[PDB]
C-alpha cells in the first residue's frame, strides 16, 4: 500500500469520458512531497469525436476539457470525466483493493487556489504546459490545468486541451507533462 | 513543517520591485532530499510594473526580484522579498519564530558557483514561461538564476521579461514549477 | 544518500558523444516514491559538438546521449555516460563502492514499454527546451525517451536538437526538470 501516491494506474485501459463513454485513457500520477503534490499527466484518446483531429473537415473542433471533482474528503465525484473505479492509492502497478475514504493531503490548497467569489480572481490557480501529439515536435497542444474553479465540489483539478494548428488526421495521444501544486494539508 | 520554506499562500504584498510592497511573490520550496522542488507565481499590485502599457512606455520590458541569503540560508534584508513572512510552514501560515538555519534549501555551490573569475556556465539558470491574467497569448519569461549575486553566500533571482507589446495588462501570473540541486 | 542517483555536480567530463569524454552530463535523479524527479544539463567541452557552426557544417543539428540499464538498474558500458561517474550521492560526491541495485529509479515498464508489435504511445517521451550559453534566443530541444533502446532492460535517452543556424555557439546549457513514473 503506497499511501503517498494517488494514480490511475499506468496501464492503457480507457478510464475517461470526454465525448463518449470511456473514449480515453488519462494517465495521472499524484505524488505527495509534503506541502507540494508532484503531478505527471498524459492522455490517449482511443475513439469518438476527439480521437482523430481533422480541422479541414471540422474547423471548430479545437479544444476539450477533462474535469476531476472532489468532495470534502478528497474523494472523486462520479460526475467527473475520470471514472472512479481505477482512481485510487497505489499498490505495485495496480491499486489498493478497496476505495479510499480520505485524500485531503492530495487536494489543491484552497487559500492558494480559492473557489470563485467576489474577491479578485488571480491567475496563480493555473499552470500551462505543452504536450506533443504522436510525440512529434511540430504537433504541440496546450494543456491548461486549473485548480479549484469548478462549482458543485470542494476541490477540483481540470485539464483543458487545445491547439491552434489546423491538424489533418492527427491522432490525439500525447507526450507527458510534469507540474506541481500546493497541497491543502 | 521543517520541510517547506514558503511565503505563505495568501495574497498580502511581501515584495518590493519598484516601490515598497508593490507585489506578492508566492514561492514554495519543498525539500525532496538532494533536490528542492520549487513553485512560483507573482502578483504586482501597484507601482511601475502593475499595469503594463508598451505603446505609451515601450521600454518597460523587464524587472528583477532578488532573494539573497547568508551562510545559514537566512534571507538578507536588501532582498526584494521581505523577511517577515518567509519562513517554514505551519498550516496555511508560518512557524511562530524566524528560522535560524536552512542550508538544506540553498542552491548547491558546486553546481552553481558564486561569481568569480572562473568560467560562468549556464547550468545555474532555469527558464520558464508564465502567463499574465491566465491568458495563453500573454506570456512572460521567468528566468531563474542560482548564486549569481554578490554580497551574499547564496541567492535565487527571478528576472521577468516580455517581448510582446502589452497594452494596459495587469502583471499577475500563472504558476511555474522547477527544481534545483540542494547544497546539502 | 539512497534517495538520489547522480553524476556529482562538478565540471569533470564524464560523457562521450562524438569522442572520449567530450562532455559533462549533469544528471540528478531523486526518488520521490512513485515518481523520479530529474534535473539535467549538459556541457560539451571538446570535439564535434563543442562549438556549433552551422554555416561551416549545415547538417550538424542533433545528437543523442543514451543511458542503458540492466535488470538491476545498473548502468551498461555502451551508455554515453561513463560508469565511474554514476552512483548514489554522498555529500557532494559519490559513495566509494559501485551500487548493485537501483530498480526503484528505473522508468516503469508498464507506463513505458519496450518496442514491440503493439501500438506505440507517445507517453514515454517528455519534451523540454534548454538554452545555449544561457541566452534566451538560443534554444535547443531536449527530447527525453524512456525504455526505447534495445540491448538493455531499461533506458533513458536524451536527444538534443536545434533548428536555428548557430554560428560559433558553445554547446553548454541551462537546466531542465522533469519527472517519470518509477518501476517500483
Ligand atoms: Zn487510435
Ligand atoms: Zn491590479
Ligand atoms: Zn491601443
Ligand atoms: Zn519529492
Largest interface: B-C, 24 and 33 residues
Q: Count the strands of chain A?
A: 12
Gyration radius of chain A, in Å: 16 Å
Shape of chain A: globular
The total count of helices of chain A amounts to 0
Order of helices and strands of chain A: EEEEEEEEEEEE
Q: Give me the CATH fold name of chain A.
A: Adenovirus Type 5 Fiber Protein (Receptor Binding Domain)
Proportion of beta-strand residues of chain A: 35-45%
**In order across it, which strands form the biggest sheet of chain A?**
7-6-1-2-3-12
Oligomer: homotrimer
Number of domains of chain A: 1
Taking the sheet with the most strands of chain A, its summary is: 6 strands, antiparallel
> What's the CATH superfamily of chain A, by name?
Adenovirus pIV-related, attachment domain
Provide the CATH architecture of chain A: Sandwich
Which percent range fits the helix content of chain A?
under 10%
Q: Briefly, what CATH class of chain A?
A: Mainly Beta
Bound compounds, each kind once, are: zinc ion
Distance between the termini of chain A: 21 Å
Class derived from helix and strand content of chain A: mainly beta
Written overview of the protein:
3 copies of one chain form a homotrimer. The first copy, chain A, is mainly β. Chain A has a single domain, classed as Adenovirus Type 5 Fiber Protein (Receptor Binding Domain) (Sandwich), CATH 2.60.90.10. Chain A is 0% helix and 41% strand. In chain A, strand 8 and strand 9 form a beta hairpin. The relative contact order of chain A is 0.25. At the B-C interface, strand 8 and strand 12 of B face strand 2, strand 3 and strand 8 of C. The complex binds zinc ion (4 copies). The site of one zinc ion has 2 residues of chain B, from loops. Chain A: This is Fiber.
Amino acid at each position: 500500500y503506497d499511501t503517498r501516491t494517488l494514480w490511475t494506474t499506468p496501464d492503457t485501459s480507457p478510464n475517461c469520458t470526454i465525448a463518449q463513454d470511456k473514449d480515453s485513457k488519462l494517465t495521472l500520477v499524484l505524488t505527495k512531497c509534503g506541502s507540494q503534490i508532484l503531478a505527471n499527466v498524459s492522455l490517449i484518446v482511443v475513439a469518438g469525436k476527439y480521437h482523430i483531429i481533422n480541422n479541414k473537415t471540422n474547423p471548430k473542433i479545437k479544444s476539450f476539457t477533462i474535469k476531476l471533482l472532489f468532495n470534502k474528503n478528497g474523494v472523486l465525484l462520479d460526475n467527473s470525466n475520470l471514472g472512479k473505479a481505477y482512481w485510487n492509492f497505489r499498490s505495485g502497478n495496480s491499486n489498493v483493493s478497496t476505495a479510499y475514504e480520505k485524500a485531503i493531503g492530495f487536494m489543491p490548497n484552497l487559500v492558494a487556489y480559492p473557489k470563485p467569489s467576489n474577491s479578485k480572481k488571480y491567475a496563480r490557480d493555473i499552470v500551462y504546459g505543452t504536450i506533443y501529439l504522436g510525440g512529434k515536435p511540430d504537433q504541440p497542444a496546450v494543456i491548461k490545468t486549473t485548480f479549484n474553479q469548478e462549482t458543485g465540489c470542494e476541490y477540483s483539478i481540470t485539464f483543458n486541451f487545445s491547439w491552434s494548428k489546423t491538424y489533418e488526421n492527427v491522432e490525439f495521444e500525447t507526450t507527458s507533462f510534469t507540474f506541481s501544486y500546493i497541497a491543502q494539508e
